[PDB]
Amino acid sequence: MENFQKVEKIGEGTYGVVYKARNKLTGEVVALKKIRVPSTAIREISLLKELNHPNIVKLLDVIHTENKLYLVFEFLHQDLKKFMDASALTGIPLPLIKSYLFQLLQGLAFCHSHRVLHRDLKPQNLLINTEGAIKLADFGLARAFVTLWYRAPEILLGCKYYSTAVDIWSLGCIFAEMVTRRALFPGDSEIDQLFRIFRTLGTPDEVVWPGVTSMPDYKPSFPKWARQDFSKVVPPLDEDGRSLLSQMLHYDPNKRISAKAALAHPFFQDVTKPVPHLRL
Numbered sequence: 001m002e003n004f005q006k007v008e009k010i011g012e013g014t015y016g017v018v019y020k021a022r023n024k025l026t027g028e029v030v031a032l033k034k035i036r037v038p039s040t041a042i043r044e045i046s047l048l049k050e051l052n053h054p055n056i057v058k059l060l061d062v063i064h065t066e067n068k069l070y071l072v073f074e075f076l077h078q079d080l081k082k083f084m085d086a087s088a089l090t091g092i093p094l095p096l097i098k099s100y101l102f103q104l105l106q107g108l109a110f111c112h113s114h115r116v117l118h119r120d121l122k123p124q125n126l127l128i129n130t131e132g133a134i135k136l137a138d139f140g141l142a143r144a145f146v147t148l149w150y151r152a153p154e155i156l157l158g159c160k161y162y163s164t165a166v167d168i169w170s171l172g173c174i175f176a177e178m179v180t181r182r183a184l185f186p187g188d189s190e191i192d193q194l195f196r197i198f199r200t201l202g203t204p205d206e207v208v209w210p211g212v213t214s215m216p217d218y219k220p221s222f223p224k225w226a227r228q229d230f231s232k233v234v235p236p237l238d239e240d241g242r243s244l245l246s247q248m249l250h251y252d253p254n255k256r257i258s259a260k261a262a263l264a265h266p267f268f269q270d271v272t273k274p275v276p277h278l279r280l
């Protein structure tokens with residue numbers, strides 16, 4: 001805490017405040033996260049600094065002093081949310097959307113292989129740089145240690161042991177948002193969130209989701225809505241994209257496409273790595 005010079009507040013998070021800081025020694029610019037200390041957390045966090053991948057924000061150091069916990073991460077200048085706002089008028093070029101989705105899936109496939117979930121993906125957690133790369137931030141902090149727009153159905157229905165599938169659902173929601181320039185399910189409460197999903201994808205039943213009527217928060221009194229055509233939901237997206245999106249938004253967590261299989265989807269046959277025009 002004394003070895004860093006806080007430059008600016010980057011924003012309050014779920015587990016703490018994040019600051020852009022300069023290492024008073026090395027002189028390097030980093031992202032300092034003050035966690036708002038259980039031994040289990042220390043161990044779980046420790047395993048994360050060994051998780052290195054080009055599409056994951058690197059956890060540089062863990063400072064545990066005076067019974068306080070600070071996480072030092074690599075620093076990137078902008079998040080996807082800010083980039084989307086800046087591109088609201090023209091929208092993000094399809095090639096860039098494809099590139100970003102492709103890299104995010106590589107990052108998830110890597111984390112999922114090590115059995116590490118995110119559980120709380122959102123545009124604010126996706127960081128981009130001038131090189132055309134995009135990285136996932138906050139990976140694993142949920143295990144070691146409010147927007148509901150990207151929350152998977154199983155979580156909303158009370159399933160306690162969710163899987164890697166919840167991250168695929170969130171990514172599918174972000175995918176749709178980049179394409180249409182509007183959040184797909186902008187709920188303002190848990191029941192509103194659930195109902196917005198049902199009104200679009202249809203109220204789930206035992207046919208599409210075996211075991212759904214046995215979920216802890218499922219109510220037989222839920223209204224029964226019909227499923228809408230994806231052509232209406234994400235209009236400009238081509239057939240390959242709609243096909244991939246539909247598999248990312250399958251109700252049944254077991255039928256939902258995995259990150260690895262998504263990487264082989266036809267939608268990515270012509271993927272490239274364009275460079276975005278960022279205004280820092």
Ligand SMILES: CNS(=O)(=O)Cc1ccc(N/N=C2\C(=O)Nc3ccc4ncsc4c32)cc1
Nearest residue numbers: 013018031073074075076077078079082137138
């Ligand atoms: C509000 N968007 S903006 O682009 O205008 C300002 C801005 C500038 C940089 C960043 N980067 N933030 C982060 C960064 O560089 N590394 C991180 C590691 C963990 C984490 N947990 C939550 S954020 C966050 C970051 C995020 C916001």
